[PDB]
Design a protein around this ligand. Structure first.
Ligand code: 4QX
Length: 347
């Protein structure tokens, strides 16, 4: 694969990406239009890596939404099949991300928070209606371009409402995603894994935008539970019983019963409607949390809310392919079939 005079793309420079790491900022040499090119090296060498490549390709090809990262192109194999070893994915060019924005000397007024939260929830309403749970939402995974467009990226951890018992995370839910943004159901293995997982992460991100500091920056497993309880208080007897691990259950039962700290105390002088919505997201019980679609209907987002401009995704996405136990070679065949289908649907 080359990027010379006769080739489709011109490599401008190597840049960073909060969701996908090292990418090449490039221009489609025919239009001059800027894009990001992600090389997935040795894509077929490791089962879990090849499975991730196929999962992301299928999820991104399923979605067509301005708040979700899109595939602009996929380079076809330029060598014989046996030699095809690295995949080149052409994506929307996104210069920054919410992590970089929050944690810099850039302005981040209440209006910036309101608009970024709106875009995130808009993308989530669509994703969630397709039966897709991101499971790893965090400010670095929320790409932001020069036109202030926010796009959800990195679907590596994404799953449906049904998962395979064959994969390790099915039991080891406390290792699903990132500690600082991990929903209590994942941390405690509460056997209730729905789109509600994402709304806890949204809450953590929303709080972080408001204070420009991480809300629950736990140093380890217990410290993470500790920090959550210092604000939310002691979990109810019902969730304590649903904790299927004696040591965790016993550490919770060991500290003094604590009352929830009003959000207005955690964030002094912050906007009322903002804390009203924030409180609806950060609840221990996944069934207690407001949904992405109900959140779009909240007064805090009334400035941007337009139901005719916040679509659902039809039909739902099917994770059956991912539940299959495929060899590295059968995954390679499925990825090559995805690339061919991408181009077949274009012409
Ligand atoms: C180091 C980073 C986090 N890795 C990463 O971006 N990977 N790793 C794999 N296996 N696949 C990807 N990215 C990817 C795969 C498919 C599409 Cl359509 C877009 C992006």
């Amino acid at each position: 694969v080359t990027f010379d005079v006769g080739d489709e793309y011109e490599i401008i420079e190597t840049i960073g990406n909060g969701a996908y790491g090292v990418v090449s900022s490039a221009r489609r040499r025919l239009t001059g239009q800027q894009v990001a090119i992600k090389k997935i090296p040795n894509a077929f060498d490791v089962v879990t890596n090849a499975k991730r490549t196929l999962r992301e390709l299928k999820i991104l090809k399923h979605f067509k939404h301005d708040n979700i990262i899109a595939i602009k192109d996929i380079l076809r194999p330029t060598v014989p099949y046996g030699e095809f070893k690295s995949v080149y994915v052409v994506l929307d060019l996104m210069e920054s991300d919410l992590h970089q924005i929050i944690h810099s000397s850039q302005p981040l007024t209440l209006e910036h928070v309101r608009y970024f939260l709106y875009q995130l929830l808009r993308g989530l309403k669509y994703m969630h209606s397709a039966q897709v749970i991101h499971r790893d939402l965090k400010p670095s995974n929320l790409l932001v371009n020069e036109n202030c467009e926010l796009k959800i990226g990195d679907f590596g951890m994404a799953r449906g409402l049904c998962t395979s018992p064959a994969e390790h995370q099915y039991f080891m839910t406390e290792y699903v995603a990132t500690r600082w943004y991990r929903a209590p159901e994942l941390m405690l293995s509460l056997h209730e894994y729905t789109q509600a997982i994402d709304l806890w992460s949204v809450g953590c991100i929303f709080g972080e935008m408001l204070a420009r500091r991480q809300l629950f920056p736990g140093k380890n497993y217990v410290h993470q539970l500790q920090l959550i309880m210092m604000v939310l208080g002691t979990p109810s007897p019902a969730v304590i019983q649903a904790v299927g691990a004696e040591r965790v259950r016993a550490y919770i039962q060991s500290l003094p019963p604590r009352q929830p700290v009003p959000w207005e105390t955690v964030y002094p002088g912050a906007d009322r409607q903002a804390l009203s919505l924030l409180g609806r997201m950060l609840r221990f019980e996944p069934s207690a949390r407001i949904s992405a679609a109900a959140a779009l209907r909240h007064p805090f987002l009334a400035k941007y809310h337009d139901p005719d401009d916040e679509p659902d995704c039809a039909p739902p996405f099917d994770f059956a392919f991912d539940r299959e136990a495929l060899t590295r070679e059968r995954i390679k065949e499925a990825i090559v079939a995805e690339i061919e289908d991408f181009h077949a649907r274009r012409e």
